[PDB]
A and B are shown apart, each in its own frame.
Chain A
Amino acid sequence: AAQAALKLVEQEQTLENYIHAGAYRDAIVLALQLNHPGRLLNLFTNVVTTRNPDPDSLTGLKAVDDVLAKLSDEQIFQLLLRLRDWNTNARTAPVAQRVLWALFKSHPANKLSSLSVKGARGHKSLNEVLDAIKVYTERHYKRIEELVDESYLVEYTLREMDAL
């Protein structure tokens, strides 16, 4: 337990240094290793908001894209737990949307079906957490959909100012 704690505080502070640096990639990977989703979410928010995205990168950082492509199944699953929470919130939803979007774009659905973790028991099992993800995504899809159906007005008005 002693040597484990030495390692823990070492990696904890080096994580902190990564956050100070904005060392986003390694910051995320050790953030996953240290399982703390507040800071993890903050990092996700920044990396979907870099203000200078790679036009090819799914998240605006190909390094993040690579490590999520290199994720293991259990990491994926605990991530999904954090994802279902962030989808439940609707301020966090777009950031919650972008990552799974890349995450779906990364790994094949055969693997996604064949996810088998020991921590799948009761409510926190696979069908259920994905189900909740399904419903909340449906809610947001509805929201942005009708929002676009509203937004057409600016084109109408622009066409009017064209008419004058």
Chain B
Amino acid sequence: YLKFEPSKSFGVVVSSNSNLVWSGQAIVAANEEVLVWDIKKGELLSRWRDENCKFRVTAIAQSRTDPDVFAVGYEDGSIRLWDSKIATSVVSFNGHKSAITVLAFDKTGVRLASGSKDTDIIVWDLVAEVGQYKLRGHKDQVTGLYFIGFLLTTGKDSLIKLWDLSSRHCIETHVAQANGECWALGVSPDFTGCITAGNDGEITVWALDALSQSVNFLQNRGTLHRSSKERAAEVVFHPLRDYFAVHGVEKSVEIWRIREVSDVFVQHVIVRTTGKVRSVDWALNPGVKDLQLLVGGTNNLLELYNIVGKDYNKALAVELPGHRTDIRSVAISSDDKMLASAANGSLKIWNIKTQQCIRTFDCGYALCCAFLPGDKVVIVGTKEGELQLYDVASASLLETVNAHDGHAVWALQVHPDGRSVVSGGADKTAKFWDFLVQSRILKVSDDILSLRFSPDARLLAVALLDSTVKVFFNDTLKLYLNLYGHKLPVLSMDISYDSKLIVTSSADKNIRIWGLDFGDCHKALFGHQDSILQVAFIPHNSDGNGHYFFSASKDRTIKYWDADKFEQIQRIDGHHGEIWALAVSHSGRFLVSASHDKSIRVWEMAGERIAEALELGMTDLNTIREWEEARQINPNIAPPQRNPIFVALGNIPAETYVLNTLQKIKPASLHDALLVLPFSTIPSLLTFLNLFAQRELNVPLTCRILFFVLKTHHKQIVASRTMRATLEKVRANLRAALRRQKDEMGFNIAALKVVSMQLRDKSVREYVDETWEEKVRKRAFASLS
């Protein structure tokens, strides 16, 4: 039951997320890991590969004033601070919910902003390693972040937002686009201006200055428009000269210069790139008078252009350590030391121990690929119905035949003896080519999807568009038998080395285990959330495991199964774009995995409560009056040093505290807790009520609890003495407060009587006639009895 482990992972340069970085080194993001290459020589300097986290990362940031320490923001919402001196995440922050979108570093690098798709923005002390706080604006997700302290940010609702840092809330807002969406944010590093790129290609330009009155810092000094009316992706300034670059995801970037606003800024150049650029990045090099623009193109490429200052030239490039459009097929060698790699547009073969590409060919499309025994030569069936033949040694194309007209040849199977190949197309014919020439063709009902030989070259089986399978004899092409039951067309097949079993994978999210003697389905099995792409046995039962097999499925999953017990023995995660192809070692020692991830991987008490609150408020009043005596003696610095719980509650006054913590409880319980209070607690409560009346609030409550205290202890109060002055205070305060209230509302009802009668007099009658009977509320009052 040897479980398998990802041993290698490669074939790739920058994924389709943003945030390229330059240092003469290029810092790009793989799927999970973050790797650095040299641009002069295409050798990667290193990788930053975290064994703990498997989420993709999409946010990459360099600390200003300190390189070699770098922040990354993942798909889950985590933050990792690494070094380049040593490939170690020094810290991780897990504060958001999903997909850290924008990062930000301090001018001094002690502070870090994290903006996410989950729309909340969390700042981070970088020496206390704490979520400092959490600015909450932004009805939808952030599309930009910058530090000034102060913060400027833009969110996808086309909303630009200026927060303070010391006083945690925003002070300025504007909209970029009334109906559109601000997508990108560009800041003058000298804090003079800001530009907002919105989805029409509209670049609104803004001037910036560096509270009871009208604060105004930003001004829309105008708007501009680029040529591309696409969603602009990113706008990057020159750190030194007066230039910047606008782009969306396109094969073009518009570099404009700095000298009305359209006069201020004109397009310097527009660089056409070979591919849709994902992310742009700046580079300046020591000793050049040029501009090193480092673009990372969505089709898995790196490009370096030189811009002259007072035309572009494709100066440097990185394409060879990975394919470019989408990997489709794989054929690992019989000695299992190299492998052919078949992508749309390209074919690259690679040595596995170097995990490094050795040869490269251009195709148009690559449906399927397979070397020929001896591994001298390789074969690709391609979308146009056609068939192309290359060799690995001279690195050339040998032959090419039109297998089908334009009927994409879906399946390719070398003969087990290795003197013929068979080819199955988007036509109704499966052809047979002995090497070559065409030995024999096969006419069927529908278009063939997949097929395979028998390891003992004795049978074959085909898997058709009709959700079915036709097992035929190898020698003569007679119907052995047929398979059904799959509701959707069977996508792949695989049979046992002893030709005793078949797994059949279809797009109906399940596989079938067939017994190959009369073809009884030994077990139908739903085991994948999506369309299972491919299935593969191990050839060798020399380990004693030959009826174990593997399933690659559209939910980014590989699953390891045993047919004999019909059980899941392992589950294989690790890719994040949908897997397309995979292959097993001839010895079965490992396996390679090709995905739309564009990677290949190799796998080996109540009153008591108010009593204490009263006590706390007494202490509060004591330190407050003492602080008053201090500040009255001298206006020197004097902190009141209230309780941590008061300052945790936001410096609220003690009276507010006690009234709130009393008003929380229900009335009956109030009656009883007020009852249960003891007499030492009484006069402090009296002083609180005195404060309440003097700063009157919830006056019926105050009177009520007052009278309760007095009646339940009417004797002990007239026993004591120190009550007397306090009771006089509460008498004066309460009597004046009640008088104030009553007099005001009595004024109110008086004036209301006046205006009501006057209104009636306005609304008496106008005409005078014989019918005076035109001269009243009513209510319903259902009663059941």
- The answer to whether B727 and A157 have CB atoms under 8 Å apart is yes
Knowing A13-B173, A127-B759, A157-B710 touch, does A101 contact B745 (C-beta < 8 A)? yes
* C-alpha spacing A136/B211, complex, angstroms: 40
- The answer to whether B738 and A154 have CB atoms under 8 Å apart is no
Which residue in chain B gives the minimum CB-CB distance to A51? B695
- The answer to whether B756 and A130 have CB atoms under 8 Å apart is yes
Q: How far, in Å, is B655 (CB) from chain A's closest CB?
A: 10
- The answer to whether B745 and A113 have CB atoms under 8 Å apart is no
- The answer to whether B731 and A113 have CB atoms under 8 Å apart is no
* C-alpha spacing A113/B763, complex, angstroms: 10
- The answer to whether A17 and B211 have CB atoms under 8 Å apart is yes
Q: Does B706 contact A (CB under 8 A)?
A: yes
- The answer to whether A154 and B749 have CB atoms under 8 Å apart is no
If A20-B167, A97-B741, A113-B759 are given as contacts, then 5 extra A-B residue pairs at C-beta distance below 8 Å, sorted by A number, are A17-B171, A109-B755, A145-B742, A151-B703, A164-B718
Q: Does A40 contact B (CB under 8 A)?
A: no
- The answer to whether A144 and B747 have CB atoms under 8 Å apart is no
Contacts of A141 in B (CB 8 A): 742, 745-746, 749
Q: Does A121 contact B (CB under 8 A)?
A: no
Contacts of A21 in B (CB 8 A): 211-212
Which residue in chain B gives the minimum CB-CB distance to A163? B718
* C-alpha spacing A73/B744, complex, angstroms: 22
17 A–B contacts, CB within 8 A, in A order: A16-B169, A94-B741, A97-B748, A104-B752, A134-B749, A134-B756, A137-B748, A141-B746, A150-B703, A151-B703, A154-B706, A154-B727, A154-B734, A157-B727, A158-B724, A158-B731, A161-B723
Which residue in chain A gives the minimum CB-CB distance to B731? A154
- The answer to whether B718 and A49 have CB atoms under 8 Å apart is no
Other-chain residue from A138, A148, A160 in contact with B718 (beta carbon distance below 8 A): A160
Q: Does B730 contact A (CB under 8 A)?
A: yes
Interface residues on B, range: 35 or more
Residues on B facing A (Cβ under 8 Å): 167, 169-175, 178-179, 211-212, 214-215, 695, 697-700, 703, 706-707, 710, 714, 717-718, 721, 723-724, 727-728, 730-731, 734-735, 738, 741-742, 744-749, 751-756, 758-759, 761-763
* C-alpha spacing A164/B718, complex, angstroms: 8
Contacts of B762 in A (CB 8 A): 113-114
Contact count A vs B, C-beta below 8 Å: 136
* C-alpha spacing A21/B211, complex, angstroms: 7
Q: Does A118 contact B (CB under 8 A)?
A: no
Other-chain residue from A10, A23, A113, A131 in contact with B174 (beta carbon distance below 8 A): A10
Q: Does A112 contact B (CB under 8 A)?
A: yes
* C-alpha spacing A6/B174, complex, angstroms: 8
Other-chain residue from A18, A131, A144 in contact with B742 (beta carbon distance below 8 A): A144
- The answer to whether B758 and A109 have CB atoms under 8 Å apart is yes
- The answer to whether B703 and A147 have CB atoms under 8 Å apart is yes
- The answer to whether B710 and A49 have CB atoms under 8 Å apart is no
Interface size counted on chain A using CB atoms at 8 A? 54
* C-alpha spacing A101/B743, complex, angstroms: 10
Q: Is the interface of A mostly helix, strand, loop or mixed?
A: helix
Other-chain residue from B215, B706, B758 in contact with A113 (beta carbon distance below 8 A): B758
In chain A, positions 1-57 with a C-beta closer than 8 Å to chain B are 2-3, 5-6, 9-10, 13-14, 16-18, 20-21, 23, 49, 51
Residues on A facing B (Cβ under 8 Å): 2-3, 5-6, 9-10, 13-14, 16-18, 20-21, 23, 49, 51, 91, 94, 97-98, 100-101, 104-105, 109-110, 112-114, 126-127, 130-131, 133-134, 137-138, 140-141, 143-145, 147-148, 150-151, 153-155, 157-158, 160-161, 164
- The answer to whether B735 and A151 have CB atoms under 8 Å apart is yes
* C-alpha spacing A162/B730, complex, angstroms: 16
Contacts of B172 in A (CB 8 A): 13
Other-chain residue from B744, B753, B756 in contact with A98 (beta carbon distance below 8 A): B744
Q: How far, in Å, is A128 (CB) from chain B's closest CB?
A: 9
Contacts of A137 in B (CB 8 A): 745, 748-749, 752
* C-alpha spacing A155/B169, complex, angstroms: 50
* C-alpha spacing A158/B519, complex, angstroms: 106
Closest 9 CB pairs of A and B: A2-B178, A101-B744, A104-B751, A113-B758, A13-B173, A23-B212, A21-B212, A112-B755, A148-B738
Residue from the set B710, B728, B753, B756 with the largest chain A CB neighbour count within 10 Å: B756
Q: How far, in Å, is A73 (CB) from chain B's closest CB?
A: 13
Contacts of A91 in B (CB 8 A): 698
Contacts of A101 in B (CB 8 A): 744-745, 747-748
Knowing A94-B699, A158-B728 touch, does A105 contact B178 (C-beta < 8 A)? no
* C-alpha spacing A35/B584, complex, angstroms: 70
Contacts of A23 in B (CB 8 A): 212
- The answer to whether B697 and A49 have CB atoms under 8 Å apart is yes
* C-alpha spacing A117/B755, complex, angstroms: 16
Q: How far, in Å, is B665 (CB) from chain A's closest CB?
A: 15
* C-alpha spacing A151/B704, complex, angstroms: 9
Contacts of B741 in A (CB 8 A): 94, 97, 144
Knowing A109-B751, A109-B755, A134-B756 touch, does A13 contact B170 (C-beta < 8 A)? yes
- The answer to whether B707 and A153 have CB atoms under 8 Å apart is yes
Contacts of A150 in B (CB 8 A): 703, 707
* C-alpha spacing A18/B706, complex, angstroms: 38
Knowing A49-B695, A141-B749, A143-B700 touch, does A154 contact B730 (C-beta < 8 A)? yes
Knowing A130-B752, A143-B700, A154-B730 touch, does A97 contact B212 (C-beta < 8 A)? no
Contacts of B727 in A (CB 8 A): 154, 157-158, 161
* C-alpha spacing A103/B429, complex, angstroms: 93
Which residue in chain A gives the minimum CB-CB distance to B734? A151
Other-chain residue from A17, A105, A140 in contact with B745 (beta carbon distance below 8 A): A140
Other-chain residue from B746, B748, B759 in contact with A126 (beta carbon distance below 8 A): B759
* C-alpha spacing A101/B745, complex, angstroms: 7
Q: How far, in Å, is B218 (CB) from chain A's closest CB?
A: 11
* C-alpha spacing A28/B540, complex, angstroms: 83
Contacts of B763 in A (CB 8 A): 127
* C-alpha spacing A105/B296, complex, angstroms: 72
* C-alpha spacing A21/B748, complex, angstroms: 32
Q: How far, in Å, is A162 (CB) from chain B's closest CB?
A: 8
* C-alpha spacing A126/B45, complex, angstroms: 80
Q: How far, in Å, is B579 (CB) from chain A's closest CB?
A: 46
* C-alpha spacing A17/B167, complex, angstroms: 12
Which residue in chain A gives the minimum CB-CB distance to B698? A91
Contacts of B758 in A (CB 8 A): 109-110, 112-113
- The answer to whether B745 and A6 have CB atoms under 8 Å apart is no
Contacts of A6 in B (CB 8 A): 174-175, 178
Q: How far, in Å, is B631 (CB) from chain A's closest CB?
A: 16
* C-alpha spacing A148/B167, complex, angstroms: 45
Other-chain residue from B214, B703, B717 in contact with A157 (beta carbon distance below 8 A): B717
Residue from the set B707, B735, B738, B744 with the largest chain A CB neighbour count within 10 Å: B744
* C-alpha spacing A157/B169, complex, angstroms: 52
Contacts of B761 in A (CB 8 A): 113
Q: How far, in Å, is A86 (CB) from chain B's closest CB?
A: 13
Contacts of B728 in A (CB 8 A): 158
Which residue in chain A gives the minimum CB-CB distance to B761? A113
Contacts of A100 in B (CB 8 A): 748
* C-alpha spacing A113/B173, complex, angstroms: 43
Which residue in chain B gives the minimum CB-CB distance to A160? B718
Contacts of B212 in A (CB 8 A): 18, 21, 23
